[PDB]
Amino acid sequence: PYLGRIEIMGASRRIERIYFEISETNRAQWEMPQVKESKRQFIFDVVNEGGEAEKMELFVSFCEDTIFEMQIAAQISEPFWGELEVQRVKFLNYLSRNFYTLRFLALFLAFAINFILLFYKVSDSPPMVYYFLEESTGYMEPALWCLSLLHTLVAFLCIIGYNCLKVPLVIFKREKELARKLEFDGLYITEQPGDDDVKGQWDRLVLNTPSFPSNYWDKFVKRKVLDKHGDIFGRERIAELLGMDLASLEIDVKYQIWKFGVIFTDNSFLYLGWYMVMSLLGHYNNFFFAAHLLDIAMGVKTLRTILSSVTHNGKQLVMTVGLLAVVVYLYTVVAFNFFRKFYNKSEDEDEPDMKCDDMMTCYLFHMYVGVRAGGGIGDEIEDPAGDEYELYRVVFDITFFFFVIVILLAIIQGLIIDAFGELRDQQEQVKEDMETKCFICGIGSDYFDTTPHGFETHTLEEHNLANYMFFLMYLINKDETEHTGQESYVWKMYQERCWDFFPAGDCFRKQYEDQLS
Amino acid sequence: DVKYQIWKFGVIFTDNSFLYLGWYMVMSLLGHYNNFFFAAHLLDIAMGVKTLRTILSSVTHNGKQLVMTVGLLAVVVYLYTVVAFNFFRKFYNKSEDEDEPDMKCDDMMTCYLFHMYVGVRAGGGIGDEIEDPAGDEYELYRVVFDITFFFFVIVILLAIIQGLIIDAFGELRDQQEQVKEDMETKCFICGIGSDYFDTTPHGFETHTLEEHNLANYMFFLMYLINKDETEHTGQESYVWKMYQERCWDFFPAGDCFRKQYEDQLS
Ligand SMILES: Nc1ncnc2c1ncn2[C@@H]1O[C@@H]2COP(=O)(O)O[C@H]2[C@H]1O
Ligand SMILES: Nc1ncnc2c1ncn2[C@@H]1O[C@@H]2COP(=O)(O)O[C@H]2[C@H]1O
Ligand SMILES: [Zn+2]
Ligand SMILES: [Zn+2]
């Protein structure tokens, strides 16, 4: 129940077993549904695009992110400057806790506003054209104003809740990759990334700051960088680069600018800002609130899955639209040269409306009308019967209908259907890989199924990835001195980021087969 | 036992098949009021015919996604309606007579109804059903409007529905094939693969017809149930008590007679 159990390859080059105590708060936070969702997404992503060389690195990074998320959740968990500060922290924690409820409230308010907008009417006469609500009850007119104000307020609170809930994870991440690239790869000491890496060029503003890591746990990254690289690349120059006084060892507007520049490049933060912008524009023109109905795609998981079929082959869809444009252009260049007389779109005999006397006009006519026509341009241009170019015209029309109407639209249909099939196959492959192999050691279930429920026992008690995450958290919370021998071994080996204590291809059973038998 | 009878009747009235038969009876009674109520019984072909059930399983497998994509269609058409009601109101005159206009987009509700009803059923979208935009200042905006409507609504979303149905067909076929393959390649009781039993000729067939027959296990359970407690032999009484405690460890998991006595059978 409270007892954790992990297996590592120890200093003796043998698989061992480590027992430790798991906190109930940590267990509850791990079983929390959003953490479970993050774990499922991580598993799916690594199984799709991951290799054994980087699998453990990605796993440890995911564990670190999860631990920081647990810290944030515990921080925001609910239990004249002083009263102002306590009220402010209470309010900010409330918004962080209720971010998702506020998002759903914004969606509901958008639906309510647009349902009210279904009652607008335009008239020349006042209630120049005026827009007004025509409904019997008379409550929709003030309800719309109240709901628009409430929706703007909810969007603002959603931005604040995001800033207080999900920005810290982004900052912690970016700080941790910057620290790792600086102290392992020497990205700025030796590599000096060019102007192409906009992230690397922007990250220069934080290296010399008083607190380069503020969300990242490793607060000794500057010391580590100094020790590792200064002795070879100039101790004084390294200290100048990192903005640390060497003499201070014996005895933040710039960082705020860096953090804000990082936040303003966040996709989710930018989406929430656009949501706020259209909420503000709704008070200028209420119909701008219709742009918030696009939030259903962002919100609903089923809608996201359905639209993933469209976006999976989005590049091929754009390419086939361009191919359609080119093919229709070729039909237009043939028409403008040989079939100009058939493009009269005027019933009146007095004034012609030739739609193919101009190349631009003929191309526009073709793209607009012949692609939306069921049988192609032959429905929309003059009948070719009783003419010298009749067979040429029927070949033209039939090839247009085949290549454009049938073949290219079939290509689009098949792209969408193949996207459906490919996504389904990806999900099935991830599920099969998880069912038939162990995440940590990669040993198949055929070996563990020698005993009844052997694979279940192995993946629930011996090599539980949740157990490994719990062990990492336990090491982090534990003090350095209190470490046992195995704990200190794995702690130092993790601080060096060597993922060889994770048992690769070996397990306790595969080691002591004879002695367990 | 009136209370038990009430409980049983409340259980029966929540049975799906019993409720379906009750509805069948209700429409049969309503047929004598209006004979055309007997047409509601033609829906019974879906309930009855296995082929029809299999065919409609393709529609119902992705039913949630079909409902969601219909809702997405409604939202997208609403967005096209909010654009039309603001910028293209003059093109929605559906009256041939010049004297009396029939503007279909002077009301937001009317324009949304027009869009959903007509532009989704039109082959090329709303551009077939509204006024031609040629010779107008908003001509390029109107052609972009019409072409995006035809692409996103007529092509993309109907393609999504088509693909949902086709993928349901494929997924159901794959499920049937996977079940058949699992039964062919593994034993139901012990889970040992056919590759091990195929050491001897027809070894897997012998194992699944004589050694670990699930029908045989069911027959043994029935035989124990019919047999009296006293008449049980030692093994019969052991398995009987262990079943009464509902411990399913007497079912051989991962082991068989051959895998046990390989040397002594050889
Ligand atoms: N190291 C692992 N830890 C947990 N689950 C694993 C591991 N390796 C494979 N799995 C499988 O992944 C499944 C995810 O959760 P389940 O409870 O379905 O059971 C799990 C196992 O079948
Ligand atoms: N324990 C089992 N009992 C019966 N059939 C099994 C068992 N395990 C696997 N099978 C397979 O399932 C098939 C169902 O009926 P068949 O006569 O086709 O042959 C059977 C075997 O191939
Ligand atoms: Zn394992
Ligand atoms: Zn068997």
From Swiss-Prot, chain A:
Record PTM Phosphotyrosine, positions in chain: Y343
Ranges that cross the membrane: 99-119, 142-162, 260-282, 284-300, 316-336, 400-420
Effect in UniProt of substituting I377T: Loss of channel activation by halothane and caffeine due to Ca(2+) store depletion, probably due to constant Ca(2+) leakage through the mutant channel
Intramembrane region(s): 360-379
Recorded superkingdom: Eukaryota
Coiled coil: none
Residues noted as binding ATP in the record, renumbered to the chain: 36-40, 434-439, 459-465
Tissue and organ distribution: Detected in skeletal muscle (at protein level). Fast- or slow-twitch skeletal muscle.
Modification after translation: The N-terminus is blocked. Channel activity is modulated by phosphorylation.
Span of the signal peptide: none
Record: residues binding Ca(2+): T481
Segments carrying motif Selectivity filter: 374-380
Residues modified as Phosphoserine: S346
Topology feature Cytoplasmic, residues: 163-259, 301-315, 421-517
Record localization: Sarcoplasmic reticulum membrane
Binding residues for caffeine: W217
Lumenal side: 283, 337-359, 380-399
Assembly notes: Homotetramer. Can also form heterotetramers with RYR2. Identified in a complex composed of RYR1, PDE4D, PKA, FKBP1A and protein phosphatase 1 (PP1). Repeated very high-level exercise decreases interaction with PDE4D and protein phosphatase 1 (PP1). Interacts with CALM; CALM with bound calcium inhibits the RYR1 channel activity. Interacts with S100A1. Interacts with FKBP1A; this stabilizes the closed conformation of the channel. Interacts with CACNA1S; interaction with CACNA1S is important for activation of the RYR1 channel. Interacts with CACNB1.
Family membership: Belongs to the ryanodine receptor (TC 1.A.3.1) family. RYR1 subfamily.
Role summary: Cytosolic calcium-activated calcium channel that mediates the release of Ca(2+) from the sarcoplasmic reticulum into the cytosol and thereby plays a key role in triggering muscle contraction following depolarization of T-tubules. Repeated very high-level exercise increases the open probability of the channel and leads to Ca(2+) leaking into the cytoplasm. Can also mediate the release of Ca(2+) from intracellular stores in neurons, and may thereby promote prolonged Ca(2+) signaling in the brain. Required for normal embryonic development of muscle fibers and skeletal muscle.
Domain comment as written in the entry: The calcium release channel activity resides in the C-terminal region while the remaining part of the protein constitutes the 'foot' structure spanning the junctional gap between the sarcoplasmic reticulum (SR) and the T-tubule. Pore opening is mediated via the cytoplasmic calcium-binding domains that mediate a small rotation of the channel-forming transmembrane regions that then leads to channel opening.
Note: Binding of [3H]ryanodine indicates that the heterozygous channel is activated by Ca(2+) concentrations 4-fold lower than normal. Single-cell analysis of cotransfected cells shows a significantly increased resting cytoplasmic Ca(2+) level and a significantly reduced luminal Ca(2+) level.
This protein's name: Ryanodine receptor 1
Organism: Oryctolagus cuniculus
Taxon lineage: Eukaryota, Metazoa, Chordata, Craniata, Vertebrata
Gene name for this UniProt entry: RYR1
